[PDB]
């Protein structure tokens, strides 16, 4: 049942690693899972539904790790804080590659991904902005810019940077060294004078 | 004979204020431009060639400016030089948000588009590790990250949160709060301990 529902979501998966979506037919992904292209059809309306749900699969993932730190601080000095959320990223979609390229390509024409990753990124834009302002009233932290500016800014960095890192883009930050970078950036400017 | 040439790209930059390249026609363009469409094929292959030709337009125009200011250094302190730059894409993309916008979609699925936009991206990163270098070589900032690494990180975010502030995009900093917000990351980041 969800079984088949599981294989549709397996061979879209594996498939995305080789090719883009424009490249993957209905007949694909039934036949890599063992199913008709009509019984396809009725788990999935298409295969762009497909991916919109390997995506909201992702981002959940991510948010309920990061629900998870937010609820269980680490003891430990701020940066390594902000490090342990930062890497929520580097490690969830780190491991979904091929998704999260499909993804941003489909941004470029989808509301529903535009949308869907707009609302978790006003969610952790809030969560980061929110830190900020605790570590300001604490004396921790200077009051510079804006809380929710800074922390839309360094959100997009990340999100922008990540991106290009796990694909190998050039220019890109390799992936062995992103994290610190990240790190550094997020510290010096949210504890900067 | 530039005069249809430029006719024609005057016309594709109005029309992408309304709507993506995919609904405009060659037809449309040869009918803003004034001539028919085997004299628009005499001066572009294709509307994607015009595109990439609007692109390659502004691109030059914001390296130009920049090579400019390189050469002839504002007399005021390092956080007002950095704005200078920064500045210069603000002003530059920021006076062609659709030729911006339409560039950004179509890198999606161009190797033209991408390639380009690369080439650009390495040689103001470069220039950027180039200042940072030059800045610890003369005590006036610390040695903490790879100069080339924190270059490609700042010089990427950058290129992110300005195009969500000319696009609107939720979430996004506000048009007039994102050169501030920019400035403080960089200046907090290459000379914070
Ligand atoms: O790296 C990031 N964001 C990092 C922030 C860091 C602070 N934060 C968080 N910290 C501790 C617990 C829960 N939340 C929210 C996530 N992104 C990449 C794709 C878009 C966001
Ligand atoms: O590039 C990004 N984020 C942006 C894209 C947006 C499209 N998309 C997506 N995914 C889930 C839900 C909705 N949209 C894949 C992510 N990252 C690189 C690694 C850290 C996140
Ligand atoms: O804002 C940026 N980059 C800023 C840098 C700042 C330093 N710099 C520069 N400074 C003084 C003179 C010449 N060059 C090179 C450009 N970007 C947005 C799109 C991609 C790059
Ligand atoms: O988003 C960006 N940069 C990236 C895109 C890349 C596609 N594209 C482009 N343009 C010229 C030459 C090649 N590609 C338009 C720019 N910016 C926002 C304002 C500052 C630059």
Same mark, same amino acid.
């Given at each position: 049942?969800?079984?088949?529902?599981?294989?549709?979501?397996?061979?879209? #998966?594996?498939?995305?690693? *080789?090719?883009?979506?424009?490249?993957?037919?209905?007949? *694909? $992904?039934?036949?890599?899972?063992?199913?008709?292209? +009509?019984?396809? =059809?009725?788990?999935?309306?298409?295969?762009?539904?497909?991916?919109?749900? $390997?995506? *909201?699969?992702?981002?959940? %993932? @991510?948010?309920?790790? $990061? %629900?998870?730190?937010?609820?269980?601080?680490?003891?430990?000095?701020?940066?390594?804080? &902000?490090? /342990?959320?930062?890497?929520?990223?580097?490690?969830?979609?780190?491991?979904?590659?091929?998704? !999260?390229?499909?993804? %941003? @390509?489909?941004?470029?024409?989808?509301?529903?991904?535009?949308?869907? &990753?707009?609302?978790?990124?006003?969610? &952790?834009?809030? =969560? !980061?902005?929110?830190?900020?302002?605790?570590?300001?009233?604490?004396?921790?932290? +200077?009051?510079?810019? +804006?809380?929710?500016?800074?922390?839309?800014?360094?959100?997009?960095?990340?999100?922008?940077?990540?991106? @290009?890192?796990?694909?190998?883009? %050039?220019?890109?930050? +390799? #992936?062995?060294?992103?994290?610190?970078?990240?790190?550094?950036? &997020?510290? /010096?400017?949210?504890?900067?004078?």
């Amino acid at each position: 049942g969800d079984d088949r529902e599981l294989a549709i979501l397996a061979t879209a #998966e594996n498939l995305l690693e *080789d090719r883009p979506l424009a490249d993957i037919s209905v007949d *694909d $992904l039934a036949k890599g899972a063992g199913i008709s292209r +009509p019984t396809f =059809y009725f788990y999935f309306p298409s295969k762009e539904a497909v991916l919109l749900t $390997l995506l *909201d699969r992702v981002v959940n %993932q @991510a948010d309920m790790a $990061l %629900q998870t730190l937010a609820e269980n601080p680490a003891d430990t000095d701020r940066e390594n804080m &902000w490090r /342990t959320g930062i890497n929520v990223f580097f490690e969830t979609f780190g491991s979904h590659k091929a998704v !999260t390229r499909a993804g %941003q @390509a489909a941004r470029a024409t989808s509301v529903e991904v535009a949308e869907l &990753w707009s609302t978790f990124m006003q969610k &952790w834009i809030a =969560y !980061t902005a929110a830190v900020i302002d605790a570590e300001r009233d604490r004396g921790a932290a +200077p009051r510079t810019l +804006p809380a929710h500016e800074l922390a839309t800014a360094l959100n997009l960095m990340n999100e922008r940077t990540l991106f @290009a890192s796990f694909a190998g883009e %050039q220019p890109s930050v +390799p #992936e062995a060294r992103v994290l610190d970078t990240l790190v550094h950036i &997020w510290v /010096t400017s949210i504890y900067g004078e």
